Amino acid sequence: PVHGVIYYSSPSMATFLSPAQDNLVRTYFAQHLKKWVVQYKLYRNAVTPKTLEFLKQNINPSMLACVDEATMIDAEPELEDIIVRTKLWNFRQSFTIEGSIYEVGSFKVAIANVLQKSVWKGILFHVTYDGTESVDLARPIIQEFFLKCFLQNNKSVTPVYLDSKLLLQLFKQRIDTVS
């Protein structure tokens, strides 16, 4: 279960890739980033940051992240949204990321266009493989086959490693979106 992730500057390639796909289609992965800032400054930072995000997960758990700066807490509600809605926390954008993991062969490809409400951000490919052995004897093998289909010129945060880890990584990747 060795996860992999890549950013790009080349929008709407996967839309052209799916017809080019030669293999099996499966569940359509999608998750939901959201901006959050406290309505008033007094929740400045640290213990009570203006930062917060709820990360909807269409895989299975539907367990929202409840992070006030490095404060993971899974929660199915949703109802917590409405609970937060009283007297707190302004909205502005979610720029949620739809996308559509597929089975292939030895390894599972995953795709997720970042369809911002603000037009667009950048494609975010994801990859998994049964790298049961040492990852560095496997990751280069993974990178052998981004050539098939071919991929070129990109931002490349692809950390070494079941999919739950991605949630922990989301904020880590959310940082890449801060700019």
């Binding site: 017809p19 080019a20 796909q21 030669d22 293999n23 099996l24």
Partner: protein, 155 residues
């Protein structure tokens, strides 16, 4: 809805019959009723069934196509596809001979023998242009059977 069921159950049969020879039935071509099986483990040829009857339609695009009729063409299963493969690779070889004639037109030469069953309607020992089903004939007499095919060529 019942129409959907009749449409889908046949797929339920064939997919079980799809295990031998990975007929992934890739939908990257078309979702028309005729259906689109793929092949493995490898432009891409596309074996298919619909009438039901034996049929071949390599396409990308839409390339060379031809049909045959072995067996009842109703029930499977896997064994019948095992019959299919034998003639099928031979058909691919014939596609290769057509690649040759496309760029003499054409050689009377044929097999180039390969496995296995003689029950094929494809069929066997194809000559110039039209196939000459007479692989069973002696190689010296195969020229004579080919002459009989030439007699068929007159009409």
């Amino acid at each position: 809805i019942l129409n959907r069921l009749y449409f889908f159950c046949i797929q339920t049969q064939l997919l079980e019959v799809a295990q031998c020879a990975e007929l992934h039935a890739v939908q990257g071509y078309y979702s028309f009723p005729y259906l689109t099986f793929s092949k493995g483990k490898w432009w891409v040829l596309a074996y298919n069934v619909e009438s039901n009857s034996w049929s071949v339609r390599l396409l990308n695009a839409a390339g060379q196509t031809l049909y045959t009729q072995d067996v009842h063409t109703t029930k499977g299963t896997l064994s019948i596809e095992s019959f299919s493969r034998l003639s099928y690779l031979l058909e691919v070889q014939i596609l290769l001979f057509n690649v040759q004639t496309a760029c003499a037109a054409p050689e009377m030469h044929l097999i180039k023998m390969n496995k296995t069953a003689d029950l094929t309607a494809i069929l066997k020992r194809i000559l110039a242009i039209s196939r000459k089903k007479x692989x069973x004939x002696x190689x010296x007499x195969x020229x004579x059977x080919x002459x009989x095919x030439x007699x068929x060529x007159x009409x």
